Design a protein around this ligand. Structure first.
Ligand code: CDL
Ligand code: CDL
Ligand code: PLX
Ligand code: PEE
Ligand code: PEE
Ligand code: PEE
Ligand code: PEE
Lengths: 459, 156, 128, 178, 603
């Protein structure tokens, strides 16, 4: 695993020693090379795992997330190239350093053979993201947003640490292999109930769960484009990865401890999908759509069936890609309008046809159009929930309909209609933006050819 | 480029601040009416008639012809609900109550008559169709190791 | 003696049927004149800002920003806990959760009981 | 559309509007030409029996009851011209209307094509450039104190002047640009 | 060896070549529409061969060429079904699409983006072929969503028009309401039968329970525009006339009926689902015919005619005659597509006018369209020995001699009478009276594309019914014996409809005027369903979406409970702790108190 960690570390001295007008080229090229190297991890095996050493190991749940994390950085660099043009060389190097540190922390988090190291890196990811949100944020609310994005997370995970060490005082180890092989049931007791709560609430808050999601619209709206990319695409999947890793010791208590969370997620998907219908902001709409998709993933994880896990993994990957592309499109519109309001900019297919095509494809992918991996995860989770209970489909069905609605609404209000007359600063889309859109959308349609690469270890 | 004073504020409870709020939203003082001071935070923002924007004048030269909107005029709170692509409150040739009664009466009558016809079906003065080989036992389900009771058909 | 039109919330009353567009008073005419005056002032301002050849940007609308701020960032500071607000919040945020919990719990209890007693015909139910 | 609206509609205007609406809905009801002509003449006659009504309080009660009658028999599916705000082809070609300033963003390779049109385009742009500076002063001097009352603009009064705020009216894309 | 599978796959793959070439240089020239038309005609000619092979022998086949993925014990693969329905419906759809494209080459000449229109039509055709030839539920769902997306993209062809966008969103909404039931059916089938393959589903389901069939019926009602979810089909006429002629008349709307046909082994085992299907079809056909009888837009009337025919086919499914319903699909394709083509020709020749109040004497002013529409209306009304007689007449005989709901039978008879009646209305109001259009006469039919495209569908609607009926093997028992009055019931009711409609229409010539009645207002406003159902529910939902979900819960109470309460408590504690005047008097008094308390408490 060091063959990928070491180049990510070496990205920092290369950036800090580069010329004042050549940092972006070097960063993008070497990030793409690192992603190409990390593509090797996709060759998983039906056997146990790729146990590299005592500290790092790779599974078919960790491999797609690692590949997505490595692939995200070049896209974030291309997205941030624009609004950091008038920025001093030292501050641009600091921004690239923060991005590289975040990628390194995520890469070390996704392997994380030991659970305490996983938690330490899980919380280490919080610092560069907070710095990015609070420093390079345009609006005045960013600071408050950052505060939220911090405290919620910590409020979730401070008990977890205690629980973690408590386990090592009883079980004696926190290595995931030993934990899996020496698993023992949790008796129905109040102490076990609170241990379950401490283990679960840590990852519930960052997913986020409905009722604990108030930090997410603030963090995504107030953050710069790269921050929105990293939060929507990868940083949301940390909770799901942690839950799928840690639910191996919570049985059979979960069989009755998942009812409040299942109810909360199955109603919050509807609530957030309806919230998306009436939104005056594009970024808030995308954030609430992300909340709905993550609530569906939470339902899948709480069901705890093989089809649930497969659908959860596929949906996480597809949602990360789709949300990243949607945030990029919204930022491209904002950089010309400088308002971030849906109804101010209208009739854009007359002026930017290729951007309208990109918007259509992104909306269709969000709308879960077959045979995309989005719908693969959707159908897997839906069938698993139907097996769990034949009534859930009703709620699920409603969500699907509502989803499509707001998606096309986002497509119709911004692209269709008559253009705004008093906006004459709509320049033709650059090659950079179109290349970013293509690099976002082509991997989705290529992954739909080989779904088993993102279906997880239970395929 | 917008001043702090311009933005929405608390509920206007005195006539002078009511007039100031009315002037802020670019409307007449006696034409301005805030939402009732309940728990919901409507506050300073004015209450405009619930009329849809589909029924606005289509021949006036609006600054936003698609939305039928003007530059500067106070936007309705639920503007995004009334955008000519959604619910519209345009008057109908027939009163709403009468349309509701006619629609639900027609639907209920159709359902009741369908149920009645289900009670009293329509058929032909014939007996059931006869199938030769033990009511097609072998070809419908199979199970050839039971030898069911033979059925013979009465030739007339 | 024709049937009378009854306006409703979703089917409003026509302008030509308004019983207030006839009993006209000089105060009403003055109000209409002032409305036209302010509308013309706003239109003149927008047209002056719109036809300027030196402008190469978006004409900022204070009404749009004010509407967005009122819809988004002003709800909480004007919020007051009242019996109406408290009851509506409790209902809309608690009732559906317990309703769905009861429904799903009853369904799963029936399913588990049928599993335990044994007549459910689970044949071919391999993938779950 | 092209004309500015007034603060209110007089009784004469309301009567004319009701007459036009009644005729339109009558021809919607009376499909054939001879039947429509007969019933339109009959309705003009019945509309004409109260032309010379003198007192305004009685003439406003006649039109008020005429608006209660029209609504009752208003043919809930009237005939609408195809390009009218209710027609089938109302905004069919609205997406083909591209603003003129978009031509400022064309690549020089694209501007190599059509050189004469672009030369005329800088000519028009210069004309507007001086005209706007003249019109700001003209409209500022001609406006009454306290702001305008009606949104009707004055014409040009000198020799070389152009009407104030003319650029976005004469540079309409087209009725059917494509 | 085995030419059948090779040809059946080849027609589908050669339907795809222009999509690949859309990035080439030909897409930037004016030869693209002719290229696509030639490709479609060649595909139809190639696909004519598997139909001949099936007709000669009865060849059936399923091809599982590419294995997609194995989920434990469930294998998903790209499987195509080449049974009777598929190999019979491919040539009909291809022929109709060829005619519609040749019509479009003349109708849409003034559109700047005509190549995009043709590629959209070809994409819709490919999606429909995928839907029809699908052998597993996943591929069927892929086609089900592809046809819906293509319909959405083609309805809102003119993006400037708000009504087009509203109609597209409405169609998407209703199709997703159907998609709910479709997903329910797939989930149940995989949970119980452990397979999305049709073969395993048929083997493992000797008696099908209610839930999967109810889901399938819901999806079929959603896409076929049954009475519950009907208005989207009449609203979908905002798009160009070729879109309505191809998609929303004869090809895409019969997809729900085709879905119900594909599951006929499971439909015959359940008796309640059949009753529900029969009732839904009867109410749909009656309501749509009653709406159509009083409309004034020609396109709206033809759309309601299509909806009534779909309801009749759903009735046929409900009386356990799937093959007869498929036959009616095949004939309806021909004659309804030609009817829409004639309507589009009239609209184009008449300066984009759709209302019939401004259509006068066109029987002589433009005769070819007149005779084509007369032939199509005669075929629609089931005139004997036409394409519509050989299906609709059998429908009527089957529904009369079946132990079914009597109310549904009465509704079907009244629907047939009303069909005759609005066909009479179209002919009378569009071709008989004196001219009523603007004086600038621009009538012109002299274009080879229009004439040839219409004449091919004329030949179809005249002879294809006979050819198909006499050239297919028998798949149902015949109603050999018939009461003499019951045999002629369809003809009698159709003639009675002609007579009554003509007599009632001739009264408009009279110099008498009268205000409309309540029934006329009910029928003209589409039964008031579009009004109420588009204002009462949506508003409420939208209101809630801002009132409870957005403002009250998310922005107020969820914000008050966790973060704001914590902030308030911490601020109050900080104020209390830090509010010290700096007096050491108080400090050491507290020191004395704590020293006193510790000794007593901890000893
Ligand atoms: C039908 C199969 C065709 C196969 C032929 C090969 C096609 C390869 C396509 C690969 C992906 C396309 C790239 C995406 C961005 C497009 C780039 C661009 O800028 O366009 C401008 C370019 C040049 O035009 P221009 O004038 O210069 O630009 C002006 C504006 O852009 C104006 O632009 P516009 O107005 O022309 O619109 C752009 C256009 C293109 O933009 C798109 O939206 C295309 C993407 C559609 C997918 C939407 C997401 C949903 C998930 C589906 C995932 C499928 C991927 C499968 C694997 C792909 C491998 C990469 O949009 C559409 O045409 C509407 C698409 C809606 C179709 C819905 C049906 C989807 C399911 C169909 C079945 C798929 C599986 C079949 C399995 C069973 C049969 C074997 O036009 C094109 O290149 C269009 C390409 C053809 C459209 C493809 C649509 C369906 C094909 C999907 C993948 C094929 C499945 C494999 C089976 C083969 C058998
Ligand atoms: C077993 C022996 C077999 C032989 C049996 C006997 C043979 C036949 C006997 C004849 C039976 C009736 C024939 C008369 C046909 C009607 C023609 C007519 O008079 O229309 C003019 C007249 C209005 O004309 P208008 O408004 O002055 O004209 C406007 C302008 O001229 C502007 O006009 P326009 O130019 O725009 O367009 C004119 C258009 C517009 O005209 C309209 O306004 C459309 C309304 C007429 C359609 C009604 C026809 C069928 C009704 C089915 C209803 C099913 C149940 C509905 C449930 C309702 C639930 C409340 O009219 C038409 O185009 C033609 C109308 C339809 C005639 C063609 C088909 C009918 C003949 C076949 C019918 C039955 C025979 C089937 C054979 C089966 C074997 C037994 O219509 C009526 O007055 C309605 C009469 C029938 C309505 C029935 C529904 C009443 C429901 C009310 C509530 C009842 C209590 C429910 C309580 C529920 C509590 C839960
Ligand atoms: C706000 C955004 C979401 C955040 C997360 C929300 C979800 C948190 C809920 C955690 C799970 C449920 C809590 C307790 C579960 C115990 C099981 C209980 O529900 O069942 C009954 C228990 O009855 C009562 O619940 C007993 C406890 C009552 C006192 C607890 C307070 C309940 C309301 C508190 C709401 C405050 C929420 C906010 C906290 C900050 C059955 O009684 P019994 O079978 O005999 O005993 C079961 C336990 N045994 C087997 C170990 C012996
Ligand atoms: C279940 C559905 C629950 C209701 C869904 C609410 C969705 C709210 C958001 C919708 C977005 C707003 C919108 O679409 O605009 C309204 C738009 C405008 O109407 P037009 O006629 O096109 O006006 C054009 C003339 N100016 O209308 C719509 O498209 C919305 C229609 C929504 C219909 C909801 C009611 C559906 C009821 C279904 C009952 C059938 C059940 C099954 C029947 C039998 C099946 C076995
Ligand atoms: C044109 C280019 C080709 C030029 C001449 C070559 C002609 C063919 C000769 C090539 C060799 C044969 C070949 O193609 O190999 C088969 C090869 C795979 O080999 P297998 O191992 O047998 O299958 C995988 C399971 N083990 O098949 C192929 O990949 C090609 C054909 C695939 C089918 C087309 C797929 C199109 C649809 C894309 C996916 C859409 C979503 C999935 C469908 C969902 C259905 C539930
Ligand atoms: C036992 C004690 C438990 C202590 C729990 C600590 C919770 C961590 C957050 C503490 C923040 C409290 C301080 C505070 O909010 O001050 C009010 C402050 C005043 O503004 P100032 O910036 O300080 O001054 C500017 C004007 N002169 O108001 C704000 O701005 C609040 C903005 C930040 C919101 C932070 C939200 C934190 C709560 C989210 C969940 C965390 C709860 C942790 C405990 C969970 C309970 C088990
Ligand atoms: C975004 C806000 C989320 C905040 C976190 C929510 C989850 C909080 C769950 C409790 C946190 C601490 C749990 C302890 C960690 C597990 C350790 C354990 O299980 O050991 C137990 C210890 O159990 C405890 O001590 C639990 C006491 C809880 C103290 C802290 C209370 C915090 C508030 C409780 C109510 C909150 C629950 C619902 C929260 C919903 C989310 C906000 C057994 O101890 P022994 O003595 O060794 O065995 C006994 C037999 N010899």
């Amino acid at each position: 695993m060091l063959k990928i960690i070491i180049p990510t570390t070496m990205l920092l001295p290369m950036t800090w020693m580069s010329k004042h007008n050549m940092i972006w080229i070097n960063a993008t090229v070497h990030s793409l090379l690192i992603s190409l190297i990390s593509l090797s991890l996709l060759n998983q095996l039906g056997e146990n795992s790729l146990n590299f050493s005592l500290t790092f190991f790779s599974d078919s749940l960790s491999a797609p997330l690692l590949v997505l994390t490595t692939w995200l950085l070049p896209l974030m660099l291309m997205a941030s190239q624009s609004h950091l043009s008038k920025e001093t060389t030292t501050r641009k190097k600091l921004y690239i350093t923060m991005l590289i540190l975040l990628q390194l922390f995520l890469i070390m988090t996704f392997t994380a053979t030991e659970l305490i190291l996983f938690y330490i890196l899980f919380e280490a990811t919080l610092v560069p993201t907070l710095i990015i949100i609070t420093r390079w944020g345009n609006q005045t609310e960013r600071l408050n947003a950052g505060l939220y994005f911090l405290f919620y997370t910590l409020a979730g995970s401070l008990p977890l640490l205690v629980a973690l060490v408590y386990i090592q005082n009883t079980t004696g180890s926190l290595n995931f292999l030993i934990i899996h092989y020496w698993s023992h049931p949790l008796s129905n007791s109040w102490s076990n109930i609170f241990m379950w709560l401490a283990c679960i609430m840590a990852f519930m808050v960052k997913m986020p769960l409905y009722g604990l999601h108030l930090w997410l619209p603030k963090a995504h709206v107030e953050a710069p484009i790269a921050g929105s990319m990293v939060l929507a695409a990868v940083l949301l999947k940390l909770g799901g990865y942690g839950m799928m890793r840690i639910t191996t010791i919570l049985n059979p208590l979960t069989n009755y401890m998942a009812y409040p969370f299942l109810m909360l997620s199955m109603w919050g998907m509807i609530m957030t999908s309806s919230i998306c219908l009436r939104q005056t902001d594009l970024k808030s709409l995308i954030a609430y759509s992300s909340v709905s998709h993550m609530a569906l993933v939470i339902v899948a994880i709480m069901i705890q069936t093989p089809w649930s896990f497969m659908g959860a993994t596929a949906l996480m990957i597809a949602h990360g890609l789709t949300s990243s592309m949607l945030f990029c499109l919204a930022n491209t519109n904002y950089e010309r309008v400088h308002s971030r309001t849906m109804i101010l900019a209208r009739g854009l297919q007359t002026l930017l046809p290729l951007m309208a095509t990109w918007w259509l494809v992104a909306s269709l992918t969000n709308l879960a159009l077959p045979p995309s991996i989005n719908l693969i995860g959707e159908l897997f989770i839906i069938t698993a929930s139907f097996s769990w209970s034949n009534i859930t489909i009703i709620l699920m069905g409603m969500n699907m309909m509502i989803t499509a609605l707001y998606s096309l609404y986002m497509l119709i209000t911004t692209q269709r209609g008559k253009y705004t007359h008093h906006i004459n600063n709509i320049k033709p889309s650059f090659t950079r933006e179109n290349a970013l859109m293509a690099l976002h959308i082509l991997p989705l349609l290529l992954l739909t050819l080989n779904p088993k690469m993102i279906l997880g270890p239970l395929y | 480029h917008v001043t702090k004073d311009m933005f929405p504020g608390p509920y206007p409870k005195t006539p002078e601040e009511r007039a100031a709020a009315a002037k802020k939203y670019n409307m007449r003082v006696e034409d301005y009416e805030p939402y009732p001071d309940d728990g919901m935070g409507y506050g300073d923002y004015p209450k405009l008639p619930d009329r849809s924007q589909q029924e606005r004048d289509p021949w006036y030269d609006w600054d936003h012809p698609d939305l039928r909107l003007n530059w500067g005029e106070p936007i309705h709170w639920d503007l995004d609900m009334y955008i000519r692509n959604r619910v519209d409150t345009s008057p109908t040739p027939v009163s709403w109550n009468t349309m509701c009664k006619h629609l639900f009466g027609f639907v209920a009558f159709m359902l009741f008559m369908f149920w009645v016809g289900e009670i009293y079906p329509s058929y032909q003065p014939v007996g059931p169709k006869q199938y030769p080989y033990n009511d097609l036992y072998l070809e419908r389900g199979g199970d050839p190791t039971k030898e069911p009771e033979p059925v013979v058909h009465y030739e007339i | 003696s024709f049937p009378k039109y009854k306006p409703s919330r979703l089917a409003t009353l026509p302008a030509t049927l308004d019983p207030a567009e006839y009993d006209i008073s000089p105060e009403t005419r003055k109000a209409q004149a002032e409305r036209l005056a302010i509308r013309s002032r706003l239109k003149r301002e927008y047209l002056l800002q719109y036809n300027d050849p030196n402008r190469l940007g978006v004409i900022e609308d204070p009404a749009l920003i004010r509407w967005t701020y009122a819809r988004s960032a002003n709800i909480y500071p004007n919020f007051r806990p009242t019996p109406k607000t408290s009851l509506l919040g409790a209902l809309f945020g608690i009732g559906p959760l317990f309703f769905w919990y009861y429904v799903f719990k009853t369904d799963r209890d029936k399913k588990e009981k049928l599993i335990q007693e044994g007549k459910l015909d689970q044949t071919f139910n391999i993938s779950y | 559309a092209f004309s500015a609206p007034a603060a209110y509609l007089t009784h004469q205007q309301k009567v004319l509007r009701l007459y036009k609406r009644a005729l339109r809905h009558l021809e919607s009801w009376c499909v054939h030409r001879d039947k429509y002509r007969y019933f339109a003449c009959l309705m003009r006659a019945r509309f004409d029996e109260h032309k010379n009504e003198k007192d305004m309080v009685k003439a406003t009660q006649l039109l008020r009851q005429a608006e209660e009658e029209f609504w009752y028999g208003q043919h809930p599916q009237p005939y609408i011209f195809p390009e009218s705000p209710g027609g089938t082809s109302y905004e069919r070609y609205e997406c083909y209307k591209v603003p003129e300033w978009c031509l400022d963003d064309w690549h020089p390779s694209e501007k190599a094509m059509y050189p004469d049109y672009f030369a005329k385009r800088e000519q028009w742009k210069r004309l507007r450039r001086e005209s706007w500076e003249r019109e700001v002063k003209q409209l500022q001097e001609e406006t009454p104190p306290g702001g305008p009352r009606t949104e009707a603009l004055p014409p040009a009064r000198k020799e070389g002047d152009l009407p104030p705020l003319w650029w976005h009216i004469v540079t309409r894309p087209r009725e059917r640009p494509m | 060896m085995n030419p059948f599978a090779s040809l059946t796959l080849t027609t589908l793959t050669i339907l795809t070549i222009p999509i690949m070439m859309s990035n080439s240089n030909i897409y930037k020239t004016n030869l693209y529409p002719n290229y696509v038309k030639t490709t479609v005609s060649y595909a139809f000619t190639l696909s004519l061969v598997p139909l001949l092979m099936f007709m000669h022998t009865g060849q059936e086949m399923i091809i599982s060429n590419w294995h997609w993925m194995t989920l434990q014990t469930v294998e998903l693969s790209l499987s195509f079904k080449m049974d009777y329905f598929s190999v019979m419906f491919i040539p009909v759809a291809l022929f109709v699409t060829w005619s519609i494209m040749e019509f479009s080459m003349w109708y849409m000449h003034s559109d700047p983006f005509i190549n995009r229109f043709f590629k959209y039509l070809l994409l819709f055709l490919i999606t429909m072929m995928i839907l029809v030839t699908a052998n597993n539920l996943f591929q069927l769902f892929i086609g089900w969503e592809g046809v819906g997306i293509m319909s959405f993209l083609l309805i809102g062809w003119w993006h400037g028009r708000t009504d087009a966008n509203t109609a597209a969103l409405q169609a998407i909404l209703y199709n997703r309401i159907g998609d709910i039931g479709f997903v329910l059916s797939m989930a149940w089938f995989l949970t119980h039968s452990n397979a999305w393959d049709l073969q395993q589903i048929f083997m493992l389901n000797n008696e099908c329970p209610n839930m999967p069939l109810i889901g399938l019926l819901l999806a079929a009602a959603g896409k076929s525009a049954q009475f519950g979810l009907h208005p989207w089909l009449p609203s979908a006429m905002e798009g160009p006339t070729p879109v309505s002629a191809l998609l929303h008349s004869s090809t895409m709307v019969v997809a729900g009926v085709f879905l119900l046909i594909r599951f006929y082994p499971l439909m015959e085992t359940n008796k309640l689902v059949q009753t529900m299907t029969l009732c839904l079809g009867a109410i749909t056909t009656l309501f749509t015919a009653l709406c159509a009888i009083t409309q004034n837009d020609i396109k709206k009337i033809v759309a309601f005619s299509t909806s009534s025919q779909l309801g009749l086919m759903m009735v046929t499914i409900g009386i356990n005659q799937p093959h007869l319903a498929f036959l009616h699909i095949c004939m309806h394709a021909f004659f309804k597509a030609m009817l829409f083509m004639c309507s589009g020709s009239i609209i184009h020749s008449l300066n984009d006018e759709q209302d019939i109040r401004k259509m006068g004497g066109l029987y002589k002013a433009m005769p070819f369209t007149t005779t084509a529409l007369i032939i199509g209306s005669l075929a629609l009304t089931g005139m004997p020995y036409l394409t519509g007689f050989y299906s609709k007449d059998l429908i009527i005989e089957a529904v009369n001699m079946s132990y079914t709901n009597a109310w549904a039978l009465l509704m079907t008879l009244i629907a047939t009478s009303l069909t005759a009646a609005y066909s009479t209305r179209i002919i009378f109001f569009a071709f008989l009276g004196k001219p009523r259009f603007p004086p600038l006469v621009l009538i012109n039919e002299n274009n080879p594309l229009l004439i040839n495209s219409i004449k091919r569908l004329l030949i179809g609607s005249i002879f294809a019914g006979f050819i198909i009926s006499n050239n297919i093997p028998p798949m149902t028992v015949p109603n050999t014996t018939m009461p003499l009055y019951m045999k002629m019931t369809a003809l009698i009711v159709t003639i009675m409809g002609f007579m009554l409609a003509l007599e009632l229409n001739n009264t408009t010539y009279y110099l008498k005027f009268k205000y409309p009645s309540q029934t006329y207002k009910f029928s003209n406003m589409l039964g008031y369903y579009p009004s109420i159902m588009h204002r009462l529910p949506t508003y409420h939902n939208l209101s809630m979406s801002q009132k409870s979900a957005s403002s009250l819960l998310d922005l107020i109470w969820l914000e008050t409970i966790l973060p704001k309460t914590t902030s308030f408590i911490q601020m109050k504690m900080s104020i209390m702790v830090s509010n010290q005047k700096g007096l050491i008097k108080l400090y050491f008094l507290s020191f004395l108190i704590t020293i006193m308390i510790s000794m007593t408490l901890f000893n």
